[PDB]
C-alpha cells in the first residue's frame, strides 16, 4: 500500500499589480469525493522557484481547499480560477499537502 503524510495550512499571497502569483493551477462535470491521495479538485501543477507563491510557502502538489474563505474542494477549474481573480493581488488559500511514501 501507501503511507500518506497529510499537512494543512493557510497562506497569504500578495503581488504587485504588474506580476503573477507565480503558480500554475491544475484540476478537473460529474462526481468527485475526497480520498486520502486526492483531497480536492484543484492543486498546484507547479510553483515558480522564486515568485510570490513560492515565497509564501506554497509548493507543487498542494491541493487547494479554500480560496479567500471559500471552500473549493469540489469546485471546477474555471470557477476556481475566477475566485482567485476576484481577490486580485491578495490571495488567502488554505491548502493540504499530501506526500506519498511506499508502505
Amino acid at each position: 500500500g501507501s503511507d500518506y503524510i497529510i499537512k494543512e495550512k493557510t497562506v497569504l499571497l500578495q503581488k504587485k499589480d504588474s506580476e503573477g502569483f507565480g503558480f500554475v493551477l491544475r484540476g478537473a462535470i460529474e462526481e468527485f469525493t475526497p480520498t486520502p491521495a486526492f483531497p480536492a479538485l484543484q492543486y498546484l501543477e507547479s510553483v515558480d522557484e522564486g515568485g510570490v507563491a513560492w515565497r509564501a510557502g506554497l509548493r507543487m502538489g498542494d491541493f487547494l481547499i479554500e480560496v479567500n474563505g471559500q471552500n473549493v474542494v469540489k469546485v471546477g477549474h474555471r470557477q476556481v480560477v475566477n475566485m482567485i481573480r476576484q481577490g486580485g493581488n491578495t490571495l488567502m488559500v488554505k491548502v493540504v499537502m499530501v506526500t506519498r511514501h511506499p508502505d
Binding site: 502569483f21 503558480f23 500554475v24 493551477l25 477549474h77 480560477v81 482567485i84
Partner: peptide
C-alpha cells in the same frame, strides 16, 4: 484536466 498560470 486544465491548467492556468496565475
Amino acid at each position: 484536466e486544465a491548467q492556468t498560470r496565475l
